[PDB]
C-alpha cells in the first residue's frame, strides 16, 4: 500500500521520468557494437572528408575555414571547400571540442567525431516523445520513443564512428516539425519564430532541406482546399516563410537558389495565395453580398489575367532555373537511368524491395496502416500534416534506397499511435482494472467473456513488442557493425582474421613517395586517399566535374598506348587499382569496370569507346579465354592480372584462377611497357604501379 498512498500526480511523473531515462540510455548504448568489436575508427568513405574538414576548422578557426581553398584535390582544377560544403556538422563538433578543452578535459578530436552520432540519437528520442504527445497523448509518446530508439533503419547511418551528415539531419528535422506543429496549434508568433530558427539550423546541417520547404507549403494548401484555413494558419505559415527564406540564403552553398530555382517556387506560390485568400474574406465580411459578387467577379478577371501572364513569362524566359538533375530523378524514375550515367552508378540509388522494408522495420510495417486509420477517423489540423508527411515518404523511399532514413521517423510515430489506441481500448474493456461506473442491467448479454477477451489481446501485443527488440538487436549486430576500411575474413581454422590492406597501402604511400606526387584512382577512393595518404588526387567522391571523371575513365578502359598519352598530359605519377580476386572481395574495380566504360564514353572525347566492344559476340562479359580481345588488352585487365596467372588461389582449382569471378583468366602472360610494379599488399587487395617516364633515346615505347 506504499505506492497507493502516493498521489497519482507523483505516480505519473515518476513513471514518465523512468521510461524516458531508460530509452535515452538504450539509444546511445546500442550504437557501440562496432567500436567494441573493432578499433575506434571512422567508417565508410564519405565520413573521412568530414573528419578532415572538422580538424581544419578547429585548429584554424572559423574565419580561415570559411575561406578555405584546397589545392590538393581535383588536380589541377582545385576545389573551393568553403563555398561547396555544408557547415552544420563541422561546427557542432568543433564547438563541443572547445568546451571540453576549456574545462581541462583533453580529448582527441577523433574521439569527438566518432562518438558524436550516438549522443544525438538520445536527444532525438526526447524530441520524439514531445511531438507525439502533442498529436495524441503522453501514452503514445512513450511508445514512440521506444520504437525510435532501436529502429534498425535509423541505426544504419547513426552507428558509432558514422560521422556523416545524416546523423544530425534527422534530429534537426524532427525539431523543426515540432516547432511548426506548436506554431499552427497555438497560433503564437513566438513559436513561429522558433520554428524558423530551427529550420535554418537544418539547412546548414544537410542538403535535404528541400524536402521540408515543399512539404510545409503542401500542408497549408490542403487546408485551404478542405476549408480549414483560419487566421492561425495564416500567421504561422506566413511568418515562418519570410524568416526562413532569408536565413537559408546566408549559407554560401545555397546562395540564391531559394529565389531563382524552380525547386523553391512552391513555397513562394503558396505564400502569394495566402495573401489573396485572407484579403478576399475580409472584403466579403464588410461588403454587402449582392454588391460583393459584382466586385468579386470584376476583380478576379483583372487580377487573374495579370497573374497568369507574369507566371508564364517567368517560366518561358528561363529566369527561373529548371529543376536540378538530382531532384528530377527522384520524381521521374526513368530519367536518371536513361540520361545521366553518373547518378545511376551510385549503389545507394537503387529502388527498394520488399525485403528491405521488412528487414529495416519489421513490426512497424504491419502497424503503419493502423496509425493512418485512426488519424483519418479523427481529423485535426495538426493531424493533417502528419498524414502528408507519411504518404509522401512512402513514395520517395521506394524510388531510392538511401531515402529510407527519412521514412524511419514517420514510421515510428505513426505505428506508436496505432499501438496506443489498441492498448487503451481493450485494456479498459478489462473491468478488473477499473470498476469505474458500471450498470449491471442492460450490460449487453451478447457478452459472456469480458475477462478473457482483454487478457488475450494484451498478451499478443506484448509478444509482438518483445520480438521487435530481438530482431532489431540481431540486425544491428550482424549488419551495421562492420567498418568498411577493415575487412573480416575467416581462416581455415575458423579464427577471425583481419585484413588491413586498405590502410597499409595508404601508409606506404605516405612515407615512401615524393610529397608532390599525384595519384590516379577511381573517384570512389578520393576521400580515403587524401585523408590518410596525404597525397594529391585527381578525382573525388563529390564529382563536381563530370568531364574530369569521364576523361579518367577513358584512360583505364583504353589500350596501354592510348592510356599513356592521357596520363602524361595530366602529370600523373602513380596509379592505384583494387583487385579482390585472391581474397574474394566482391567490390573490386573489375566489377565497376562497366560504369567506367559508360562514363568514359558519355563525353564527346570518349565517342570511340563502345560498350558492346567489350562483350563477347554473344553479349557476355567474360575474362576467360573466350573474352573479348579488347577487354583482355585494356589497361585495367593488365593491372589487376599482372603476374597473377601463376598464383594458385585454390588447391582445387588450376593456377591463375580468379576466385570472385569463379573463372580462369584467359591471358596469363604479358608485360607492362609503360607501367612498373611499385608495391603490392600482402593479399593483393591494393596494387600500386608507377608511371614510366619517356624514353631516354627517343625510341617509341
Amino acid at each position: 500500500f506504499g505506492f497507493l498512498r502516493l498521489s497519482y500526480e507523483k505516480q505519473d511523473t515518476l513513471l514518465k521520468l523512468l521510461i524516458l531515462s531508460m530509452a535515452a540510455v538504450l539509444s546511445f548504448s546500442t550504437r557501440l557494437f562496432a567500436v567494441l568489436r573493432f578499433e575506434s575508427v571512422i567508417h565508410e568513405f564519405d565520413p573521412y572528408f568530414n573528419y578532415r574538414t572538422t580538424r581544419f576548422l578547429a585548429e584554424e578557426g572559423f574565419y580561415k575555414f570559411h575561406n578555405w581553398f584546397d589545392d590538393r584535390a581535383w588536380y589541377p582544377l582545385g576545389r573551393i571547400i568553403g563555398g561547396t560544403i555544408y557547415p552544420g556538422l563541422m561546427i557542432t563538433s568543433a564547438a563541443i571540442y572547445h568546451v571540453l578543452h576549456f574545462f581541462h578535459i583533453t580529448i582527441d578530436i577523433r574521439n569527438v567525431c566518432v562518438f558524436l552520432a550516438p549522443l544525438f540519437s538520445s536527444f532525438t528520442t526526447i524530441v520524439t516523445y514531445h511531438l507525439t504527445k502533442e498529436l495524441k497523448d503522453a501514452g503514445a509518446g512513450l511508445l514512440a520513443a521506444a520504437m525510435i530508439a532501436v529502429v534498425p533503419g535509423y541505426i544504419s547511418r547513426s552507428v558509432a564512428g558514422s560521422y556523416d551528415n545524416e546523423g544530425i539531419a534527422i534530429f534537426c528535422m524532427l525539431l523543426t516539425y515540432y516547432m511548426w506543429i506548436k506554431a499552427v496549434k497555438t497560433g503564437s508568433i513566438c513559436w513561429a519564430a522558433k520554428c524558423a530558427l530551427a529550420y535554418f539550423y537544418m539547412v546548414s546541417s544537410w542538403g535535404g532541406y528541400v524536402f521540408l520547404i515543399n512539404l510545409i507549403p503542401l500542408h497549408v494548401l490542403v487546408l485551404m482546399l478542405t476549408g480549414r484555413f483560419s487566421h492561425r494558419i495564416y500567421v504561422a505559415y506566413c511568418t515562418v516563410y519570410c524568416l526562413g527564406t532569408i536565413l537559408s540564403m546566408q549559407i554560401s552553398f545555397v546562395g540564391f537558389q531559394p529565389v531563382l530555382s524552380s525547386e523553391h517556387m512552391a513555397a513562394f506560390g503558396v505564400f502569394g495565395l495566402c495573401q489573396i485568400h485572407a484579403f478576399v474574406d475580409y472584403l466579403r465580411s464588410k461588403l454587402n453580398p449582392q454588391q460583393f459578387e459584382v466586385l468579386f467577379r470584376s476583380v478576379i478577371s483583372l487580377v487573374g489575367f495579370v497573374l497568369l501572364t507574369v507566371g508564364a513569362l517567368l517560366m518561358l524566359t528561363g529566369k527561373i532555373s529548371p529543376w536540378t538533375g538530382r531532384f528530377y530523378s527522384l520524381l521521374d524514375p526513368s530519367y536518371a537511368k536513361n540520361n545521366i550515367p553518373i547518378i545511376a552508378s551510385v549503389s545507394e540509388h537503387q529502388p527498394t524491395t520488399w525485403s528491405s522494408y521488412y528487414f529495416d522495420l519489421q513490426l512497424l510495417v504491419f502497424m503503419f496502416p493502423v496509425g493512418l486509420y485512426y488519424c483519418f477517423s479523427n481529423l485535426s489540423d495538426a493531424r493533417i500534416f502528419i498524414i502528408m508527411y507519411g504518404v509522401t515518404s512512402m513514395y520517395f523511399s521506394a524510388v531510392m534506397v538511401r531515402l529510407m532514413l527519412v521514412l524511419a521517423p514517420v514510421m515510428c510515430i505513426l505505428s506508436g499511435i496505432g499501438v496506443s489506441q489498441v492498448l487503451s481500448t481493450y485494456m479498459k474493456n478489462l473491468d478488473i482494472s477499473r470498476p469505474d461506473k458500471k450498470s449491471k442491467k442492460q450490460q449487453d448479454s451478447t457478452y459472456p467473456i469480458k475477462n478473457e477477451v482483454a487478457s488475450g489481446m494484451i498478451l499478443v501485443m506484448a509478444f509482438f513488442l518483445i520480438t521487435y527488440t530481438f530482431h532489431s538487436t540481431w540486425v544491428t549486430s550482424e549488419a551495421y557493425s562492420s567498418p568498411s576500411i577493415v575487412l573480416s575474413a575467416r581462416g581455415g581454422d575458423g579464427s577471425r582474421i583481419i585484413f588491413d590492406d586498405f590502410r597499409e597501402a595508404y601508409y606506404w604511400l605516405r612515407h615512401n613517395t615524393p610529397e608532390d606526387a599525384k595519384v590516379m584512382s577511381w573517384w570512389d577512393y578520393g576521400y580515403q586517399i587524401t585523408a590518410m595518404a596525404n597525397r594529391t588526387i585527381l578525382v573525388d567522391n563529390n564529382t563536381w566535374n563530370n568531364t574530369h571523371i569521364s576523361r579518367v575513365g577513358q584512360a583505364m578502359a583504353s589500350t596501354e598506348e592510348k592510356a599513356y598519352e592521357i596520363m602524361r598530359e595530366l602529370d600523373v605519377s602513380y596509379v592505384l587499382v583494387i583487385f579482390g580476386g585472391l581474397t574474394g572481395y566482391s567490390s573490386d574495380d573489375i566489377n565497376k569496370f562497366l560504369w567506367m566504360v559508360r562514363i568514359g564514353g558519355s563525353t564527346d572525347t570518349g565517342k570511340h569507346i563502345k560498350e558492346n566492344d567489350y562483350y563477347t559476340p554473344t553479349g557476355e562479359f567474360r575474362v576467360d579465354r573466350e573474352g573479348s580481345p579488347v577487354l583482355l588488352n585494356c589497361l585495367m585487365y593488365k593491372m589487376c592480372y599482372y603476374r597473377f596467372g601463376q598464383v594458385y588461389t585454390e588447391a582445387k582449382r588450376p593456377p591463375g584462377f580468379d576466385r570472385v569471378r569463379n573463372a580462369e583468366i584467359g591471358n596469363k602472360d604479358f608485360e607492362l611497357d609503360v607501367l612498373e610494379e611499385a608495391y603490392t599488399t600482402e593479399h593483393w587487395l591494393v596494387r600500386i604501379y608507377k608511371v614510366k617516364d619517356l624514353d631516354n633515346r627517343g625510341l617509341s615505347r
Binding site: 448479454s445 459472456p448 467473456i449 478473457e452
Partner: protein, 50 residues
C-alpha cells in the same frame, strides 16, 4: 527417440494445447443464464415462506 520424435511433439502439442484452451473458453462462454423465470418462482416461494 528424442532426436526423431521431439519435432513431432512440438507439432502435436501446440494444437492440443490450443484445443484445450478453446475448450475451457467454450465451457466458460457456454455458462447458461439462469432463467429469471425460475428465479421469480423462487421469489414466489419466498413470499409463501414469509
Amino acid at each position: 527417440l528424442v532426436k526423431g520424435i521431439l519435432p513431432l511433439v512440438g507439432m502435436a502439442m501446440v494444437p492440443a494445447l490450443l484445443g484445450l484452451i478453446g475448450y475451457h473458453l467454450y465451457r466458460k462462454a457456454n455458462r447458461p443464464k439462469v432463467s429469471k423465470k425460475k428465479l421469480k418462482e423462487e421469489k414466489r416461494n419466498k413470499s409463501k415462506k414469509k
